[PDB]
């Protein structure tokens, strides 16, 4: 529209209206000119002695907007209002708007770097509505809209891995190259803006409640069962039985079973670090799955287990989501102690989910005879069974919202391991790049020009999300557990900027506070 | 309405009308004043050396109506008419009515206990329509409407277990107390009655047929497959093949597989008791699952297996439903032989379901080389796989009808292990209690009165259920197996009262008699 | 209506609908025949050496329904939902219903006490709509509807004090006798019920929030004031000034002042009991007001002060509401330690209200000269001043809801000291009594009969209250403090019945959790 007219306003807000809540976030972004306007074939061989690290892909000159983290939409107080009062929620719609674009020309001379705006430069933007591009958004990576509204952020560079040959850095006949310029995109000069809208598919509500009953103790503790159980064999081999008494939950017949489990090693946090094995390199003794001839770690394991047992300091670390308390630099290889990190605990699900670091149980391992005694053996892993129930991983304020279900034609219970909503058609990738501007070209050449004017753009982005809420409807008499701002002798305010302006966050806030009977 | 006017009639009947059958049952109940009108915190530590027996809960002064057993609705003859003629059935609706209430005042003086009616006393009744209370009805417990119509029964006392801490008798911050008086209930004096109606959710038909074909022998025995199989390696290592011939079912390619299995120990009934290991305590060598740090027995195991192999006397007792031939007293710890009990056999499902006490099969356990021979190892347990089929547990005349699916947000194939229909919203809990009547209180006190007049109530209850039937539609030429009243030299009539008036039942009647090809 | 027909149902519930919440409570009561149907002149002289204890009054044969406590209407969980999510609330309407009346005849013979119902006996009920009777309901006395729904309670006996002469037990010419039979009342036999409705007058919302700013630090800490202050006098007597700098809150000019205060003694709870004066009898050294020649203690003092200073263990006990953790017997004179009681803390109001046990400040006490130095003196009490602000006492789950404003024709800020809503026309007194039934009178006499049949009645009472809520509307970013069910190593569930059936309550729950800037 115009150089001296704003193409949009600043909208950050939450509006609660019954069973709906609309969140609005606006952030300032900055887009670098990645790769110098070129596509590059990126590849890697075996790194750290693991050929599962090998890949073949492409880095593109495009950047992308990632809105896949709860804190990009929810302030800590609104999150508290959500988890203390509702049984569940789910995304309904999304509206994105990119505006107030500013393209800057950078010029370095002799020890001098000036910056001036280029009023005629454009920025290109498109959304991948048909999912024709490798969707890299739901894999727990950096670059999402920052939690704290005033924080300015750089858009991450779009890249992808395709097929590599024999766990090496070579491509195969099936490796695919995708050209992002081969999509129709809108071009924006300083007065133009871009708007996009999207609606989520019917997805089940995330469960924001913990069970107030144990799965194996659902029977009335005052009445016996009209069922009998084999208890022994007489001195002559006659089978003997007894009635299952009231309250003896170790013996009652069960109708339902706990979800699938796969044993993972348990480690003690600090209080119990003296009981941990010393100097052990976890990779060699970790849970791994094989695929195409290589072994990959599979944290945080499939859903169905609890990583800790409420009241203990032992964690099944590979079944745990681990966040940094602060934003880290790219490529850091420092070894962090637990004092800098935020460990998540899924102990609220222990009345239903089995403990990840213990054996799942025991089964018969032979045929009993008058000469051979009955034998049992414990099992470390057990997959899904008919009539089994479990609770999915909880969502966190600083964790992912959705994940795209891989299109293969066959899947089971499409719920991403890192938590969130599994979607067949998630919010489309929104790509953006600075349109190239050639330097001073005087003569002709059939070779593509390589000399460009260095630029970078900036602007604002606003994301509006409507969420549907599930009202709590309990008849519990006594008070419930609530997430509360409880600190003893605070030296600073959590979820607030400190003296240096840095946003501080000392806790990973889950969703499970309210209870429900089974 | 009035003291001298009946508030309802006696309806016991079955009406067959095409693909529908309506059952009506009326019984006389008696409600004691449980706990003396108080709520009590009930708890237990480790019992019988098992901390899975520990619990923390509440016993309430309420009683409840349980209609969750087939014989509370079906006479033995109607059950026979059902299982000999239909392929399946399922619940459609339910109507309950409580009437002809009589409250009796009990007064004991010096070695004298008189009983008079209290015309002004009430009884309180409510149904938990929103499932806000711990549903204790579908866990195979006593207290259901008796099988024989003239039998008067006592309503069981409502109680529940909530969360306990570290497998002990202490509560946790999440333990929930539910006050039943915090629900709106109808109050009834002698002339009043209470009626309730409910409709079942679309649930799949229970299958009342046995397969007349084996899962691995579905191929035409007269034609070969156009498929070849690896049979060996030559003296030089060349792989060799052969065509899969007609009728050689051990070698045909299969399209479908048997359901999941988990080996359980097998024991011989009497005929073969001399081949059983002697003096063995089953608990230590039983199939158990771990949950929250404790091990629980999980009878009757998940669906997918047959507990016996038709033609043998060996049973996988932990995969078996065991009923008493008669009603037992509360808390009995006698050790019963198999002569007093009714063992159920699921052998009709053996053409499809794997045998619970045998190994499930064998798989490769290494990589074959010119130096290492191919090795295989048997597996005792195997969970669900794509393209697998199995048959659910059969229902019995003396067994449960439904079970409530635990609300967790994630489950697989919600079919209760004890058989029946898995429901998200089952018939609501119907609670009832005698309204308290204070004794002679003369002075004031801020402390709740503890002195009450002792009462108990009685009345009639009628339950009407509509069932939907699936007609048999077979082209089998020869006669089918039918359940029949066949006894040799009967000393009494089964399913009839004996000389002392006691109702006798010598057999557990299943549902699988008709056959169907796969 | 009828002997065998219930005249009402049981309604206990809470229904939240936007800015309104309707609470319903039903309880069972028992009414003794107080005084044996007679009015008695009750009086007392000086008790415990205090003639403020003298009184002259009347005890009547009537009982009354008291609904003036929050826990008679709010379950602990609904209270938590209220205080964690709203900024305020206020009563809108009330509906009361008394039904299912049962009159019992008591007859004691030789060491035998039988109880039978008297179907023709009545109970009398009336409400004092015009406030013509001494309103004894809002003075923190026992007898209200019990907190726990299943608890049966005795109605307290209605009595009142009128004028006594010279602090003695004699009446004056102005002492008034009120005959309750001189009001029209409804008579109820077993089939009848009584209903009453009432609407509250526009009353201001109770404030359920704590200030997140201090009253004396409202100025921007980054900007100075354009005001100067007198700081000293030169060596020649010239007055000198300085500008009030940014953030120096000790010197900024203020626009508002803290509410009124009246120093009360401070005492240390247990942690600091070694610093308390030993063996001191509080009455002689307590805060007292004189009236009609006698001195009365005036706990909990007028509004405007905080009784504790967050972070300390010292309490201004006379400015504190003290509840028992359990119901106590009538007339107990035991000396309780703080381990049995629930002390309330108003520290949330300290940013605005002055500390009750410290001096209020200091003022000039002379006229400065070249010979006399300026002198200041501290003041222990200070009443209301123009431009002063304070916060009223908080309400508790176990405290009073309203108080009747004394009709005198002149009052200031009608807010009861014990907290709650001050009303000119509060819910009317609801009186009830057992109609007298003469014994066997054979001959005539002009003297009123004294021989009566001993009876007592019982029934149910339901109270429905509509409350209006004030939605929280904050822009605070970081999480707020919330009331939470947090206990470490619980041996029992708080706000739940224990093993003996007794309802336990270990905490007084206030209303101030959310914050607001000033």
Across the interface, whether the CB atoms of A84 and C482 are under 8 A apart is answered yes
| Angstrom distance (rounded) from CA A185 to CA A183 | 6
Query: Which residue is it, tokens 């499970």?
Result: A512
Residue C247: both structure tokens together:
């953030």
Nearest to B291 among A216, A474, A477 (CB): A216
Segment (H or E) for A305: strand A305-306
Long-range contacts, B440-444 (Cβ 8 Å, 24+): B440/C104, B440/C106, B440/C113, B440/C115, B440/C456, B441/C30, B441/C32, B441/C154, B441/C456, B442/C32, B442/C456, B443/C32, B443/C154, B443/C330, B444/C32, B444/C143, B444/C154, B444/C155, B444/C156, B444/C157, B444/C330
**Alpha-carbon gap, residue B129 to A475, rounded angstroms:** 12
Q: Are A466 and C468 in contact (CB under 8 A)?
A: no
CB pairs under 8 A between B and C: 174
Q: Do C112 and B109 touch (CB under 8 A)?
A: yes
CA angle C459, C465, C469 (to 5 degrees): 160
- C75·B173 Cβ contact <8 A: no
Residues of A in contact with C81 (CB under 8 A): 85
The kind and range of the H/E element at C78 are helix C76-85
Residue from A361, A386, A414 whose CB has the most chain B CBs within 10 Å, to mutate:
A386
Q: CA B89 to CA B95: how far, in whole Å?
A: 18
Q: Do B192 and C5 touch (CB under 8 A)?
A: yes
E strand or H helix that includes residue C126: strand C123-127
B165 reaches C (C-beta below 8 A)? yes
CB burial readout B448-458, b (16+ within 10 A) else e:
bbeebbbbbbb
CA distances from B496 to A37, B493, B504, B506, B507 (A): 91, 6, 6, 10, 12
Q: How far apart are CA A322 and CA A345, in angstroms?
A: 10
CA A39 to CA A181: how far, in whole Å?
Answer: 11
Rounded distance between C-alpha atoms, residue A186 and residue A149, angstroms? 27
Residues of B in contact with A379 (CB under 8 A): 381
CA A218 – CA B131 distance, rounded (Å): 14
Tell whether A268 lies on the interface with B, counting CB pairs under 8 A.
no
What is the distance between the alpha carbons of residues A427 and A128, in angstroms, rounded to a whole number?
A: 9
**Could you tell me how far CA B251 lies from the centroid of its own chain?**
39
Is C32 in contact with B443 (Cβ distance < 8 A)? Answer: yes
Cα–Cα distance, A223 to B154 (Å, whole number):
12
Q: Which of C429, C475, C479 is nearest to C133 (CA)?
A: C429
For the packed helices C76-85 and A76-85, what is the interaxial angle rounded to 10 degrees?
A: 160
Question: What phi and psi, each to the nearest 5 degrees, are found at residue C350?
Answer: -60, -20
Helix, strand or coil, per DSSP, at residue C328: coil
Q: Which residues pair with A98 in a beta bridge?
A: A194, A461
Measured distance CA(B485)–CA(B479) in Å, rounded: 17
Nearest to B191 among C5, C486, C498 (CB): C5
What is chain C's length?
518
**Binary contact (B440, C104; C-beta < 8 A):** yes
Assigned token pair, C106: 């008591």
Q: Does C484 touch chain A (CB under 8 A)?
A: yes
Nearest-neighbour CA in chain C from A432: distance (Å): 31
Burial class (CB in 10 A: 0-12, 13-18, 19+), C389: middle
Is residue B318 within 8 A of residue B265, CB to CB? The reply is yes
3-class secondary structure, A210: strand
Sign of CA dihedral A376, A381, A385, A389: positive
Whether C330 contacts chain B with CB within 8 A: yes
Using alpha carbons, list the distances in angstroms from residue B97 to B30, B461, B464, C363: 15, 6, 9, 80
Q: Say how far apart CA C61 and CA C376 lie, in whole Å.
A: 60
Handedness of CA A257, A262, A263, A269 (dihedral sign): negative
Mutate to test the interface with A, among C16, C212, C478 (most CBs of A within 10 A): C478
Find the radius of gyration of the CA atoms of chain B. Answer: 28
Question: Taking CB atoms and an 8 Å cutoff, what residues of chain C touch A511?
Answer: none
Instruction: Determine how many CB atoms are found less than 10 A away from the CB of residue A7.
Output: 19
Residue with token string 């709509």: C129
Which C positions 175-234 lie with beta carbon below 8 A of chain B?
190
Half-sphere exposure of A251 (CA within 13 A, CB side): 26
Separation in Å, CA A160 to CA A56, A136, A177, A180, B440: 9, 7, 10, 12, 84
Dihedral of CA atoms A152, A157, A161, A162 in degrees, nearest 10, equals 130
Contact A354, A360 (CB under 8 A): yes
User: Distance between CA C175 and CA C57 in Å, rounded?
Assistant: 9
Burial class (CB in 10 A: 0-12, 13-18, 19+), C234: exposed
Tokens 């629980």 belong to residue: B296
* Rounded CA separation C391/C403 (Å): 18
Pairing of strands C123-127, C186-188: antiparallel
Residues from chain C that touch B102, judged by Cβ atoms under 8 A, are: none
The per-residue DSSP string of B397-465 comes to TTS--EEEPP-SS-EES---TTSSEEESSPSPPEEEEEPP-B----S--SSPP--B--EEEEEEEEEEE
**Tokens 């009876």 correspond to what residue?**
C455
Token duo for residue A256: 């339902």
Minimal Cα–Cα distance from B100 to chain C, Å?
Answer: 11
A474, A485, A496 member nearest C480 (Cβ): A485
| Minimum CA–CA partner of C326 in chain B | B447
Give residues 441 to 480 of C whose Cβ lies within 8 Å of A: 474, 476-480
Q: What are phi and psi of B402, to 5 degrees?
A: -135, 170
Say which residue the tokens 């309707």 belong to: C22
| Residue A135 CB burial class (10 angstroms; 0-12, 13-18, ≥19) | middle
Q: Which residue has the tokens 């009506």?
A: B24
Q: Among all chains, which residue has been given the structure tokens 């995969």? A: B319
- Cβ–Cβ < 8 Å for B4, C467: no
Could you tell me if C88 lies within 8 Å of chain B, comparing CB atoms? no
Element (H, E) at A80: helix A76-85
Give the integer Cα–Cα distance in Å for C65 and C430.
6
- Cβ proximity of B162 and A210 under 8 Å: no
Q: How far apart are CA B306 and CA C10, in angstroms?
A: 50
Selection from C27, C189, C190 nearest residue B120 by Cα: C190
Solved by what technique?
cryo-EM
The DSSP secondary structure of C438-449, one letter per residue, reads: B----S--SSPP
Best CA proximity match to A439, nearest among A430, A431, A448: A448
- The pair of structure tokens assigned to A94 is 């999304």
Answer for the pair C104, C456: CB distance below 8 angstroms, yes or no: yes
For residues C171 and C44, the answer to whether their CB atoms sit within 8 Å is: no
Is C26 in contact with C12 (CB distance < 8 Å)? Answer: yes
User: What is the end-to-end Cα distance of chain A in Å, rounded?
Assistant: 58
Task: State which H helix or E strand residue B93 sits in.
Answer: strand B86-108
Closest partner residue to C32 among B2, B118, B442, by Cβ?
Answer: B442
Nearest-CA neighbor of B180 among B339, B61, B76? B61
Residues 6+ apart with CB under 8 A from C457: C30, C31, C101, C102, C103, C104, C121, C123, C434
CB atoms under 10 Å from CB of A453, counted, come to 15
Contacts 24+ apart (CB under 8 A), C218-224: C218/C255, C218/C256, C218/C518, C219/C249, C219/C252, C220/C246, C221/C246, C221/C247, C222/C246, C222/C247
Residues facing C433 on adjacent strands: C124
For B122, the closest chain C residue by CA position comes to C6
What six digits make up the tokens of A223?
A: 């009445």
Question: Could A479 and C484 be called an inter-chain contact, meaning their C-beta atoms sit closer than 8 Å?
Answer: yes
Both tokens of residue B435?
Answer: 């309204």
Distance CA A228, CA C211 (A): 63
Q: Taking CB atoms and an 8 Å cutoff, what residues of chain B touch A355?
A: 290-293
- Asked whether the beta carbons of C42 and C59 are under 8 A apart, the reply is yes
Calpha distance A181→C127 (Å, rounded): 84
Neighbouring residues of A471: CB distance < 8 A, sequence distance ≥ 6: A19, A86, A87
In order of A19, A199, A208, A398, the CA distances from A90 in angstroms are 11, 12, 11, 16
**C95 to chain B, minimum CA–CA distance in Å?**
16
Instruction: Select from C42, C72, C46 the least CA-distant residue to C58.
Output: C42
How many whole angstroms separate alpha carbon A28 and alpha carbon A21?
A: 24
* Interchain contact, C76 vs A477, CB within 8 Å: yes
Chain B residues whose CB is inside 8 A of the A477 CB are 176-179, 182
Sign of the C-alpha dihedral computed for residues B329, B333, B334 and B338 taken in this order: positive
Cα distances (angstroms) measured from residue B364 to each of A366, B367, B376, B377, B430: 20, 8, 4, 6, 55
- Closest chain A residue by Cα to residue C12: A475
Rounded distance between C-alpha atoms, residue A24 and residue A93, angstroms: 12
Tokens of C294: 């006698």
A321 DSSP assignment:
-
Q: Which residues of C touch A79 (CB under 8 A)?
A: 479
Contacts of residue B336 in chain A, CB cutoff 8 Å?
228, 240-243
At residue B49, the 3 state secondary structure works out as coil
Kindly state the greatest CA–CA separation across chain B.
106
**Alpha carbon separation from B255 to A380, B215, B252 (Å, rounded):** 30, 9, 10
Task: Give the per-residue SS3 of C157-184.
Answer: EEEEECCECCCCCCECCCCCCCCHHHCC
d(CA A505, CA C229): 42
- Find where tokens 């013996």 sit: A251
Pairing of strands A514-516, A209-211: parallel
The whole-angstrom distance between residue A310's C-alpha and the CA centroid of its chain comes to 23
Contact A481 C483 (CB under 8 A): no
Pairwise CA distance, residues A415 & A404, whole Å: 10
Nearest CB partner across the interface for B335, out of A225, A231, A477 = A231
Record: contact A254-B178, CB cut-off 8 A: no
User: A182, A154, A176: which is closest to A41 by C-alpha?
Assistant: A176
Helix (H, G, I), strand (E, B) or coil at B282: helix
How far is CA C52 from its chain centroid?
A: 21
Specify the length of chain B in residues: 518
d(CA B419, CA C497): 37
Which of helix, strand or coil describes residue B194? Answer: strand
**Subunit contact B170:C100, Cβ cutoff 8 A:** no
Q: Nearest CA to C21 among C76, C86, C65, C71?
A: C86
Whole-number Å distance between alpha carbons of A298 and A321: 12
Taking contacts as CB-CB distances below 8 angstroms, the residues of chain A near C496 are 477-478
Q: How many CB atoms lie within 10 A of CB A150?
A: 11
Half-sphere exposure of residue B405, counting CA atoms within 13 Å on the CB side?
21
Alpha-carbon distance B170 to B176, whole Å? Answer: 13
Asked if A493's CB is within 8 angstroms of C479's CB, the reply is: no
User: Exposure pattern of C251-263 as b/e (b: 16+ CB <10 Å)?
Assistant: ebeeeebbbbbbb
Q: Which residues of A touch B259 (CB under 8 A)?
A: 386
User: Could you give the CA distance from residue B68 to residue B402 in angstroms, rounded to a whole number?
Assistant: 7
Give strand pairing partners of C116.
C105
∠ CA B266-B269-B272, nearest 5°, is 95
Q: Which of C77, C477, C482 sits opposite A484 (nearest CB)?
A: C482
The SS3 call for residue A307 is coil
User: What is the C-alpha separation between A102 and A96, in angstroms, rounded?
Assistant: 18
Question: Bridge partners of C204?
Answer: none
Could you give phi then psi for residue A268, rounded to 5 degrees? -90, 135
* CB proximity list for B477: less than 8 A, separation 6 or greater: none
Nearest to B438 among C10, C117, C152 (CB): C152
User: DSSP per residue over A149-208, as a string?
Assistant: TT--EEPPEEEEE--BSTTSS-B-TT-----GGGS--EEE-TT--EEEEEEPPP-PPEE-
Distance CA A214, CA B55 (A): 10
Cis peptide before A23 (omega within 30 of 0): no
């Amino acid at each position: 529209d115009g150089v001296g007219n704003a193409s949009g306003d600043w909208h950050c807000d939450s509006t609660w209206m019954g069973d709906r809540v609309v969140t609005k976030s606006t952030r300032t972004w900055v887009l670098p000119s990645y790769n110098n306007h070129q596509y590059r074939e990126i590849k890697s061989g075996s790194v750290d002695g693991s050929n599962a690290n090998a890949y073949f892909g492409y880095s593109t000159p495009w950047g992308y907007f990632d809105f896949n983290r709860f804190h990009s939409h929810w302030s800590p107080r609104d999150w508290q209002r959500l988890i203390n009062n509702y049984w569940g929620f789910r995304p309904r719609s999304l509206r994105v708007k990119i505006f107030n674009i500013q393209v800057k020309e950078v010029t370095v001379q002799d020890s001098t770097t000036t910056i001036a705006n280029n009023l005629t430069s454009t920025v290109q933007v498109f959304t991948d509505d048909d999912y024709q591009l490798p969707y890299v958004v739901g894999n727990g990576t950096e670059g999402c809209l920052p939690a704290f509204p005033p924080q300015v952020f750089t858009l991450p560079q779009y890249g992808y891995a395709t097929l590599n040959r024999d766990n090496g850095d070579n491509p195969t006949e099936r490796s695919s190259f995708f050209c992002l310029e081969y999509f129709p995109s809108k071009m924006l000069r300083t007065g133009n803006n871009f708007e996009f809208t999207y609606s989520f598919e019917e997805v089940p509500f995330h469960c924001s409640f913990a069970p107030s009953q144990n799965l194996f103790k659902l029977a009335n503790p005052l009445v016996d069962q009209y069922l009998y159980r084999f208890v022994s064999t007489s001195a002559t081999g006659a089978i003997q039985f007894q009635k299952n008494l009231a309250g003896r939950y170790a013996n009652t017949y069960k109708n339902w079973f706990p979800g699938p489990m796969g044993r993972t090693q348990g480690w003690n946090t600090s209080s119990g670090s003296s009981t941990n094995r010393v100097s052990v390199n976890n990779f060699s003794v970790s849970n791994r799955m094989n695929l195409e001839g290589a072994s990959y770690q599979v944290n945080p394991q499939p859903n169905g287990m609890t990583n800790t047992l409420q009241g203990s300091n032992r964690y099944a670390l590979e079944n745990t989501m681990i966040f940094n308390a602060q934003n880290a630099t790219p490529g850091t290889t420092s070894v962090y102690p637990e004092d800098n990190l935020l460990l998540t605990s899924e102990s609220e699900t222990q009345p239903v989910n089995r403990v990840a670091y213990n054996t799942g149980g025991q089964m018969a391992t032979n045929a009993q005879n008058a000469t051979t005694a009955p034998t049992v053996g414990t099992y470390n892993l057990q997959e899904v069974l008919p009539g089994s129930v479990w609770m999915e991983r909880d969502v966190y304020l600083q964790g992912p919202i959705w994940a795209k279900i891989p299109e293969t034609g066959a899947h089971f219970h499409p719920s991403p391991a890192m938590g969130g909503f599994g979607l067949k058609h998630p919010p489309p990738m929104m790509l953006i790049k600075n349109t190239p501007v050639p330097g001073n070209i005087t003569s002709f050449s059939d070779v593509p020009v390589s000399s460009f004017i260095t630029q970078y753009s900036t602007g604002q982005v606003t994301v509006e999300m409507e969420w549907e809420l599930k009202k709590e409807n309990s008849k519990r008499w006594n008070p419930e557990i609530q997430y509360t701002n409880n600190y003893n002798d605070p030296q600073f305010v959590d979820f607030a900027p400190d003296g240096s302006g840095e946003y501080r966050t000392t806790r990973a806030i889950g969703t499970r506070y309210l209870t429900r009977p089974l």
